TrEMBL record:
Residues of the full protein shown: 676 to 742 of 1582
Name listed for the protein in its UniProt record: ATP-binding cassette sub-family C member 8
Organism for this UniProt entry: Mesocricetus auratus
Family: Belongs to the ABC transporter superfamily. ABCC family. Conjugate transporter (TC 3.A.1.208) subfamily.
Subcellular location as annotated: Cell membrane
Domain of life: Eukaryota
Function: Regulator subunit of pancreatic ATP-sensitive potassium channel (KATP), playing a major role in the regulation of insulin release. In pancreatic cells, it forms KATP channels with KCNJ11; KCNJ11 forms the channel pore while ABCC8 is required for activation and regulation.
């Protein structure tokens, strides 16, 4: 199974409302070198923090797993 398994990905920073991100569905398996590119401020650092759990997720089905 993919280690980074995200279905909803409704990331947010404000504890009440204000979703910082939504509709994020990524399934990245282990040993998959995936470089991320994008525009300035287009949910890069926020996505990285949400991957480690540093960002509040409102509606997201995440099942973290390893080998
Ligand atoms: N912990 C946080 N709490 C609130 N807002 C945040 C937090 N972390 C990032 N943000 C903001 O949310 C947005 C997400 O942008 P993104 O994650 O792409 O930033 P970035 O990768 O640091 O951008 P840049 O290209 O400017 O370096 C930005 O406006 C950023 O300032």
């Amino acid at each position: 199974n993919f280690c980074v398994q995200i279905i909803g990905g409704f990331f947010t920073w404000t504890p009440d409302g204000i979703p910082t991100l939504s509709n994020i569905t990524i399934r990245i398996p282990r040993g998959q070198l995936t470089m991320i590119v994008g525009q300035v401020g287009c949910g890069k650092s926020s996505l990285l923090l949400a991957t480690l759990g540093e960002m509040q997720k409102v509606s997201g089905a995440v099942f973290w797993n390893s080998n």
